[PDB]
Design a binder for this molecule. Structure first.
Ligand code: MG
Ligand code: ZN
Ligand code: ZN
Lengths: 149, 1335, 50, 73, 248
DNA sequence: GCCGTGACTAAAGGCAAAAAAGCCTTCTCGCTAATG
RNA sequence: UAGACGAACGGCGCGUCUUUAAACCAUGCGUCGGGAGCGCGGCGGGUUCAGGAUGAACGGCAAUGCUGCUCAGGCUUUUUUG
DNA sequence: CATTAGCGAGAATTTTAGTCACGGC
């Protein structure tokens, strides 16, 4: 631990029973600043209705969430990601839920080639920020490796 | 929605009514896709679809297809929720016997057939024949044969008799068993036989047969034929990661049973030999029994996990069972956790709250207001900007939490204070900030404990939270009247530092106009915080009819007390501050305010007390230091001197004069005396100090050592800690319990050698083990209190009965442990209070006794007062308000609709954690001597001897108040008399304790009549003493020819005739017992009633066993019927006795172990309910003899003595409540006009209310007797079967209720809790009163 | 769970986790080591006539 | 700015009946219309009702009378 | 920088804390002098005695150090490394007594009582009594506050009993324990217990309607039926025992 | 023989959290895959 | 490349074939979608009877279609905390 | 270029009370 200056005295009830009073000088010098290293895992299996694929092609996501990702869908090293953001973009297929002429025309105007996708991408847990330091990729043999790999 | 709950057995037709189809295929899933199998455990045709409103094959869809069975798929199409409703049924090839009724402790089928349980299992498991049809042969209806016996008997009688194997045979026997004929024969046989052994099982049999007869049941239904199937979803096959599936073990049990059934049914067509089919039948029976309950019959079936697979019965009972895990307490939404952290600036009614936690918690609340103001349009947009934390979001969030109460919860809770309400105030940070004064209520400390928060939703919830659960409304603990907002730690230390005068200080010796300028002096530094000065103050007295009286005076006081006086309210006088202001006083001081100036001034005053205490403690600067602990100089020297004594003592052990034990005791005493002396010396030198006064003289004022401020003020710790810090630790205990011979001569301020430190671990580790284990018994005990007291709740205003209990202050031969004033406070008198002068009424009957009346009670010095007691309240299914007395929570008469039982259970359970799991009589003080139940006589020498049993001593003061109480044996010595104003410290009683006297009664000449020499009595002139005397021998040498002969010494006067005892002409001879030496001889004078012979011979678990009344290992026997004592026929194993009443006959006889001690003899008169031997007393016979009012007094006395020994104050009325639930059950003595069996056991309330309406007509009552059923058995013997099931032992309770066909009416509280209905208590009491009125 | 007077030098008496399992997770001493059979033994200094 | 309800409780028989009548009146407040009889100070309807409890012109009987006279329109 | 609490000294009986603090105060005070003379960049000789003077203090100590062997650059490097405080080693059961600590502090320029005067920052006035001030070793435990913060308004739901999940990993709620339920029954609070046991735990109809109503403004619950109770019924109906409700 | 005693069996034994991991029967076969 | 089929229709996916509806599997491959009620009739499957492995009738439900009207993740195991 | 594996799918301690069994007079 650290070596600190201490004094035994009640101080306006802030040490009422066992609470400890700490000066801002402590955090100014970063005496008790600590480091944690959390690990996030993203799994891409081969479930029904097709396999699971990872890329940047995601719907209902802003351009800010894509500025931190490459074309392959893996966040760059050192990017200062925050809580609730996107780290790895994973998608899974479905059917197409039929056709409706009005929504079909709107989609054709928009330019959506195939809206058969469900978002299951890995997101940063809520309330935790930080900086990505490393990304390791495991791929089964006999499977093509993307430019990131 | 529903009125009551009905439970009974089931029938195959009823099962088919439940079911939708049959399951015939053990397969579950196709596993190619994820669709259910055909006729499998998840068959769509039998249970329902997979996804809402389209069949499996998908032919039918759209809204138009509701309620259609798609023929191709064969599946009814509807919403998927039906998967939680439909149930399947399996048609077993052969009948099977349900294990529960088979294998409970009382065997239902075994009792019904009057058959041993062991052989029924043999029959069912296909190993031994049993006759099912005797016919006209040499066999009985229920006879038993083996395979070779059947082989022999088959040829002798042919087909005339029939004997089979298995559940089919049992079912055939059950179906053919008549009921009415058995009932008639049982009724006729019950009156004929006279044998108590037969009576028990006879009554059980007739009760079971009556229950089956009176209910719509059939015995063969106890034998299963069709097996209902649990719905599919309740055993989910949730897909886990990858292709593997998570399979609940219950599905494995269904698969095994279906496989066995399919194999048996396919083997039945092959006409296989009986050997093969019997094995498969046994396999199927074992499988179904394990499915109903695993591990009951034999080894529990386990999978690859090597753990017992869960069964249906298992999933009900146990901590992991459905009830105690998902019915009483279930996980809830709108909650949060945090780390608790103290905050001083908060007011009493508000606690801090992190911004993030509140923002996420009140998400539903902000949504509505957000769209109300138009800042949002849809729900998804609202979610979008709320997670954007815009500026308006904080504004609206602050708007919606202006006065919205929240609930704070700490796990675990121990009493009513564990759940609190507060008005949150948003604060930055990530911790909950809580007001300090309430942390004592939580019994929590700010060392990283985690706090939990919930949020009420409805208007009713918020309103009741505001009205009840804020800390303002709860200042007095439900356990006792003492407050729970008692200041502690910093505030008490600082306030004590405020009020403590010094002989010399700056600013001493002037006069101040008032407190206002006095505060000015301290801030400017002109005067010290403490200085004895004169000052003018103002006092507002409410002595008139509730109006303040202002007066001005001058007081000699300190500056600090004047400073504190500013925040004191108007009513309190100034004398409440002139003292040293200790911790004990200030709390009581706060209490005094609650007795005068209401509630809100008290809470504001408490807040100001906190603020002033913190501020001036901070300005004080109280600090600990190494130099503070002053070790006495002489201490070391004393220790050296002590060694000398032990150095001598061991020599006496090495010299042979003193044994090891005596030397051990001497060493222990020497060390104890040395420790006490050094403790006294250290306390004396630490407590005092020397300082030069204003006149140049050294005056010894109270020491200002920091350790002494923490000690004396009581802020933290006790005198033991200070003793241990400076003085030597004293004697210490070994792990077994023995005391080490050499204690520790050093203290903590100095060093500790390795060996001395090692032995110190024994105490510490033992204490930690006690803390770790004692919580298990305590909390569990709490449950055993809650379940038996949950039913009780106040229902009516007044029962209108004057019966009650007599209560007197407790005296234990020394100081009175509890004065009468404290015990009676806040209760209601059962009778009118009479002055010691007769015909003068001090207090009327049916009048609540509050504090002002108690002053009148003590001013007149009332001896004792009889008060209303809820143990005998006349109300039904509750207790009337007046019997309960004063509510501690509100300070006034109890209300209607709140459950007393729950608060009583909490009050009796919370202090459990503070417990520990593992000659002559001298008058003490001044006063006269009074005795009651005393029948004394004067001996020859003029002394007073006693001829009674219950002779008690009293120390009557100048007024008549009781001071002392003692018990004396017969033939005691009295140095004084009754009513004499004697002096204290005088030996007034003396007698030989270690042996018993065989004293005579009256003077005369001893004549040894019927004196036998040779076998019974002989002149054993022992050479040790060489004294020739007649010695009566024991039963060893003598035999039945001489032991039965009793040598009786006929006590005669000088005339030689029988003594004319007053009242009785019976000669007062005393039969000589064994080993009773006749010390005196014939012809020598005898004193009046002189000795004939010197005849020779605790904690929480204790309280828990006392509540449920364990039978002691040595049950003291007491008298049963009042009458003249008579002996009985002996030598038939042990001794016997019979008591003859004056008028009625004497049919009572009982067997008494003759090896046991005795206290009663033939020539004596004993009242019923009086001791015969001595030892622990079973409360059952106490209640049977002395009545209800006696047993309630004993239990309360013992438990309160234990708690006072452990130093925790608990009100008595809480104990009584359990006692009222203790006597819930009674047993009929004689049926009379009632409609119950002679031996029937029916609850007292119901039997009394049923009797009352019958006797109101031209009929007579029914004689009964209240019994004693402990909590563990009283809880299960309750009408509400679900309530009993929730507590313990679900299997027996469910089976017993089912076979009896009981019917719960949801009268209890937990019943309404289970189904989510409003509780029949609290605010919900009014709603139910509306409900029952309309019904 | 209770500490025995023979633990001196072989089992620490003052370091152990608190809670449901106390006294069953006793830690090793500093100088202590294991014997050939598996018994606990401690170093000691031999004394010869003072 | 309400800290205790002792005066409100003593104005009524017990606390529970006060809670239920206050709940009824507050529900009457919130559902629509039925403005209070006392000036407000930016407070939610829960504490608004409690106020008319200590000034004492409202109770269970008075609320029932008002409801009856309004439904007898 | 840290304000401890004195009232935890007597009851806890951890008096070694005060002695440790007092020893720490002397150690840092020694470093300041070395810091002061290093600031003036005094000669190596002036160092050599002073460091020797501190080490020579003590009665019959087993630690004997000869600084004459050390070269000038070694002494300079050691003193530079020593400016943050002289490390003090103490055997578990052979530590120095109070007199030795007092003598060591006498080498410094601090009061022997080990209690210096202080001035409050807010008020600027000298406190009534001298207060203990020294240096202590502090440890930051592995229980972070944000690792325990957890709150759920509406997350997931169990498939068996239709109840909210448990555990921080799944946005779990709080388990309303049975003791808490009896605590609620102790008060007159019936509405709160009913709503908490019906409309927030499992009632599918209730919590769906309740969520809509609170958004729409209304604060009113509905009784419904706890689906956990229905499960038990089916469970009881799973056996040969028959159970059922009755007429409304 | 009938009340009394010993041996056998059943039931229950703090409450909340967090954090990690492991994992949800065993014997047999043809086309595709692994090995030489 | 295109076209056709794969428990009623259509779109897409997947498999087979090349002008044919077959082949595949077997609660007849997968996903999704049909504004609703009343009227017609029956896809589809079921019952009865007869005939001697086949045929006839039937309407409780109902496919594609048609005229008219009304409606908007559990358990287990550890470790730690209070 | 031939051989076998294999693999996914298919199936065969502590406390106490209650109750049954022996016994002895
Ligand atoms: Mg704590
Ligand atoms: Zn279908
Ligand atoms: Zn009564």
């Amino acid at each position: 631990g650290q070596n600190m200056r201490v004094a035994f005295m009640p101080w306006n009830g802030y040490n009422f029973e066992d609470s400890i009073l700490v000066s801002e000088r402590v955090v100014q010098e970063d005496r008790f600043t600590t480091i944690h290293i959390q690990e996030l895992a993203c799994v891409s299996r081969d479930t029904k209705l097709g396999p699971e694929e990872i890329t940047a092609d995601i719907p209902n996501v802003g351009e800010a969430a894509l500025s931190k990702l490459d074309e392959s869908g893996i966040v760059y090293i050192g990017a200062e990601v925050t809580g609730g953001d996107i780290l790895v973009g994973k998608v899974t297929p479905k059917g197409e839920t039929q056709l409706t002429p009005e929504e079909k025309l709107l989609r054709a105007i928009f330019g959506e080639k195939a809206s058969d996708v469900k978002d299951s991408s890995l997101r940063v847990p809520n309330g935790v920020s930080g900086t990505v330091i490393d990304v390791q990729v495991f791929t089964r043999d006999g499977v093509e490796k993307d430019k990131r790999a | 929605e529903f009125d009551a709950i009905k439970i009974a057995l089931a029938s195959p037709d009823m099962i088919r009514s439940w079911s939708f189809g049959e399951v015939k295929k053990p397969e579950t899933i196709n596993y190619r896709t994820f669709k259910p199998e055909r006729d499998g455990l998840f068959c769509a045709r039998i249970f329902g679809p997979v996804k809402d409103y389209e069949c499996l094959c998908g032919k039918y869809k759209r809204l138009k297809h509701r309620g259609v069975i798609c023929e191709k798929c064969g599946v009814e199409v509807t919403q998927t929720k039906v998967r939680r409703e439909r149930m399947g049924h399996i048609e077993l090839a052969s009948p099977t016997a349900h294990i529960w009724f088979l294998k409970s402790l009382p065997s239902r089928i075994g009792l019904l057939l009057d058959m041993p349980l062991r052989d029924i299992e043999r029959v069912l498991y296909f190993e031994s024949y049993v006759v099912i049809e005797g016919g006209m042969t040499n066999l009985e209806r229920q006879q038993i044969l083996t395979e070779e016996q059947y082989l022999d008997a088959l040829e002798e009688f042919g087909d005339e008799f029939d004997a089979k194997m298995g559940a089919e045979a049992i079912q055939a026997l059950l179906k053919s068993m008549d009921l009415e004929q058995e009932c008639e024969q049982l009724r006729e046989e019950l009156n004929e036989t006279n044998s108590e052994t037969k009576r028990k099982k006879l009554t059980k049999r007739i009760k079971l047969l009556e229950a089956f007869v009176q209910s719509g049941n059939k015995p063969e239904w106890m034998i299963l034929t069709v097996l209902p199937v649990l719905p599919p979803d309740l055993r989910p096959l949730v897909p886990l990661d990858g292709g593997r599936f998570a399979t609940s073990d219950l599905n494995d049990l269904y698969r095994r049973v279906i496989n066995r059934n399919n194999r048996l049914k396919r083997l039945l067509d092959l006409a296989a030999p009986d050997i093969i089919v019997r094995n498969e039948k046994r396999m199927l029976q074992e499988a179904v029994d394990a499915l109903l309950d695993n591990g009951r019959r034999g080894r529990a079936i386990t999978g690859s996990n090597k753990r017992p697979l869960k069964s249906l019965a298992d999933m009900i009972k146990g901590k992991q069972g459905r009830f105690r895990q998902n019915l009483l307490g279930k996980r809830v939404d709108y909650s949060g956790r945090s780390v608790i952290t103290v905050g001083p600036y908060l007011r009493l009614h508000q606690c801090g709250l992190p911004k993030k936690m509140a923002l996420e918690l009140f998400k539903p609340f902000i949504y509505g207001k957000l769209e109300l103001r138009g800042l949002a349009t849809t729900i998804k947009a609202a979610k979008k900007m709320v997670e954007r934390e815009e500026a308006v979001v904080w504004d609206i969030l602050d708007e919606v939490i202006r006065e919205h109460p929240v609930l704070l919860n700490r796990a675990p809770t121990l009493h009513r204070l564990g759940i609190q309400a507060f008005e949150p105030v948003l604060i930055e940070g990530k911790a909950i900030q809580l007001h300090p004064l309430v942390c004592a209520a939580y019994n929590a400390d700010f060392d990283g404990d985690q706090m939990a928060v919930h949020v009420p939703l409805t208007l009713e919830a918020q309103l009741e939270a505001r009205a009840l659960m804020m800390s303002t409304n709860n200042i007095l603990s439900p356990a006792n009247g003492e407050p729970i907002i008692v200041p502690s730690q910093d505030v008490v230390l600082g306030l004590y530092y405020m009020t403590r005068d010094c002989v010399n200080a700056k600013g001493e010796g002037m006069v101040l106009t008032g407190p206002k300028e006095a505060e000015r002096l301290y801030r400017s530094g002109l005067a010290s915080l403490h200085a004895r000065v004169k000052v003018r103050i103002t006092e507002y007295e409410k002595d008139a009819n509730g109006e303040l009286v202002a007066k001005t005076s001058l007081k000699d006081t300190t500056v600090g007390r004047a400073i504190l006086w500013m925040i004191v309210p108007k009513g309190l006088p100034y004398s409440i501050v002139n003292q040293a202001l200790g911790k004990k006083a200030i709390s009581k001081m706060l209490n005094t305010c609650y007795r005068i100036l209401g509630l809100k001034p008290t809470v504001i005053f408490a807040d100001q007390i906190m603020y002033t205490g913190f501020a001036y403690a901070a300005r004080s600067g109280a600090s600990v230091g190494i130099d503070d602990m002053v070790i006495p100089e002489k201490k070391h020297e004393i220790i050296s001197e002590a060694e000398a004594e032990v150095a001598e003592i061991q020599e006496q052990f090495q010299s042979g004069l003193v044994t090891a034990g005596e030397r051990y005791n001497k060493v222990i005493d020497i060390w104890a005396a040395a420790n006490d002396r050094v403790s006294k010396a250290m306390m004396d030198n630490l407590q005092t100090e020397t300082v030069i006064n204003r006149d140049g003289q050294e005056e010894k004022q109270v020491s200002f050592n920091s350790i002494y401020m923490m000690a004396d003020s009581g802020a933290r710790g006790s005198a033991a800690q200070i003793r241990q810090l400076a003085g030597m630790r004293g004697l210490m205990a070994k792990p077994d319990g023995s005391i080490i011979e050499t204690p520790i001569t050093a203290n903590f301020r100095e060093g500790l050698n390795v060996l001395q430190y090692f032995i110190s671990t024994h105490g510490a580790r033992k204490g930690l083990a006690d803390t770790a284990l004692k919580t298990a018994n305590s909390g569990y005990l709490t449950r055993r209190l809650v379940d038996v007291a949950q039913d009780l709740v106040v229902t009516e205003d007044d029962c209108g009965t004057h019966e009650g209990i007599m209560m007197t202050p407790v005296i234990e031969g020394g100081d009175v442990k509890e004065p009468l004033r404290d015990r009676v406070l806040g209760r209601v008198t059962a009778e009118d209070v009479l002055k010691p002068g007769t015909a003068d009424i001090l207090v009327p009957r049916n009048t609540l006794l509050h504090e002002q009346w108690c002053d009148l009670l003590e001013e007149n010095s009332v001896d004792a007062v009889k008060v209303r007691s809820v143990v005998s309240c006349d109300t039904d299914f509750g207790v009337c308000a007046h019997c309960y007395g004063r509510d501690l929570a509100r300070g006034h008469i109890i209300n209607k609709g709140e459950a007393i039982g729950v608060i009583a259970a909490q009050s009796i359970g919370e202090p459990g954690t503070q417990l520990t799991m593992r000659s002559s009589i001298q008058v003490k003080n001044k006063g006269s001597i009074k005795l009651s139940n005393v029948k004394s006589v004067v001996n020859s020498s003029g002394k007073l001897v006693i001829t009674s049993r219950n002779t008690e001593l009293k120390l009557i003061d100048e007024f008549g108040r009781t001071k002392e109480s003692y018990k004396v044996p017969y033939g005691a010595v009295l140095a004084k008399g009754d009513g004499e104003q004697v002096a204290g410290g005088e030996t007034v009683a003396n007698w030989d304790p270690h042996t018993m006297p065989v004293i005579t009664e009256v003077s005369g000449f001893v004549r040894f009549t019927d004196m036998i020499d040779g076998q019974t009595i002989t002149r054993q002139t022992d050479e040790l003493t060489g004294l020739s005397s007649l010695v009566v021998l024991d039963s060893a040498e003598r035999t039945a020819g001489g032991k039965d002969l009793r040598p009786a010494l006929k006590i005669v006067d000088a005339q030689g005739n029988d003594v004319l005892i007053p009242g009785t002409d019976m000669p007062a001879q005393y039969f000589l017992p064994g080993k009773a030496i006749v010390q005196l001889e014939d012809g020598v004078q005898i004193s009046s009633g002189d000795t004939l012979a010197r005849i020779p011979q605790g904690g929480l678990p204790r309280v828990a066993d006392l509540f449920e009344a364990r039978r002691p290992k040595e049950p003291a026997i007491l008298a049963e019927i009042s009458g003249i004592v008579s002996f009985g026929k002996e030598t038939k194993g042990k001794r016997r006795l019979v008591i003859t009443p004056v008028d009625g006959s004497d049919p009572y006889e009982e067997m008494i172990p003759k090896w046991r001690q005795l206290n009663v003899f033939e020539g004596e008169r004993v009242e019923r309910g009086d001791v015969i031997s001595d030892g622990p007393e079973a409360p059952h016979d106490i209640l049977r003899l002395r009545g209800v009012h006696a047993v309630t007094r004993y239990i309360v006395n013992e438990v309160q003595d234990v708690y006072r020994l452990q130093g925790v104050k608990i009100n008595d009325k809480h104990i009584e409540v359990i006692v009222r639930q203790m006597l819930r059950k009674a047993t009929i003595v004689n049926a009379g006009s009632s409609d119950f069996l002679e031996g029937e056991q029916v609850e007292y309330s119901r039997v009394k209310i049923a009797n009352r309406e019958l006797e109101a007509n031209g009929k007579v009552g029914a004689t009964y007797s209240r019994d004693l059923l402990g909590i563990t058995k009283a809880s299960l013997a309750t009408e509400s079967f679900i309530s009993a099931a929730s507590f313990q032992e679900t299997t027996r309770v469910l089976t017993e209720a089912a076979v009896a066909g009981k019917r719960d009416e949801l009268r209890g509280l937990k019943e309404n809790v289970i189904v989510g209905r409003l509780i029949p208590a609290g605010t919900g009491y009014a709603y139910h009163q509306d409900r029952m009125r309309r019904r | 769970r209770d500490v025995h007077p023979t633990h001196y030098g072989r089992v620490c008496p003052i370091e152990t986790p608190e809670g449901p399992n106390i006294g069953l997770i006793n830690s090793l001493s500093v100088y202590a080591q294991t014997n050939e059979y598996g018994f606990l033994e401690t170093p000691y200094r031999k004394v010869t006539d003072g | 700015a309400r800290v205790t309800v002792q005066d409100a409780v003593e104005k009524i028989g017990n606390r529970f009946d006060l809670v239920l009548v206050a709940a009824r009146r507050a529900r009457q407040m919130q559902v629509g219309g039925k403005d209070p009889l006392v000036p407000e100070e930016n407070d939610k309807t829960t504490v608004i009702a409690l106020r008319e409890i200590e000034e004492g012109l409202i109770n269970n009987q008075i609320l029932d009378v008002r409801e009856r006279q309004e439904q007898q329109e | 920088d840290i304000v401890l609490n004195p009232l935890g000294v007597p009851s806890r009986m951890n008096i070694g804390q005060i002695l440790e603090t007092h020893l720490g105060m002397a150690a840092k005070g020694i470093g300041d002098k070395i810091n002061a003379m290093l600031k003036q960049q005094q000669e190596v000789a002036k160092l050599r005695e002073f460091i020797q003077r501190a080490y020579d203090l003590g009665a019959d100590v087993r630690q004997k150090v000869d600084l004459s062997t050390f070269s000038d650059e070694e002494v300079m490097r050691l003193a530079e490394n020593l400016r943050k405080g002289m490390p003090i080693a103490t055997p578990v059961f052979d530590g120095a007594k109070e007199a030795e600590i007092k003598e060591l502090l006498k080498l410094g320029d601090l009061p022997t009582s080990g209690q210096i005067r202080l001035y409050d920052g807010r008020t600027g006035e000298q406190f009534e009594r001298p207060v203990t001030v020294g240096y202590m070793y502090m440890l930051k435990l592995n229980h972070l506050v944000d690792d325990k913060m957890h709150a759920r308004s509406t997350g997931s739901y169990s498939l068996v009993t239709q109840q909210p999940l448990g555990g921080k990993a799944q946005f779990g709620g709080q388990r309303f324990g049975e003791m808490e339920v009896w605590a609620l029954e102790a008060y007159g609070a019936a509405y709160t217990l009913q709503e908490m046991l019906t409309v927030k735990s499992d009632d599918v109809n209730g919590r769906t309607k309740m969520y809509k109503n609170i958004v729409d403004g209304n604060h009113q619950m509905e009784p419904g039926m706890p689906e956990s109770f229905n499960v038990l019924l089916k469970e009881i109906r799973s056996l040969g025992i028959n159970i059922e409700l009755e007429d409304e």
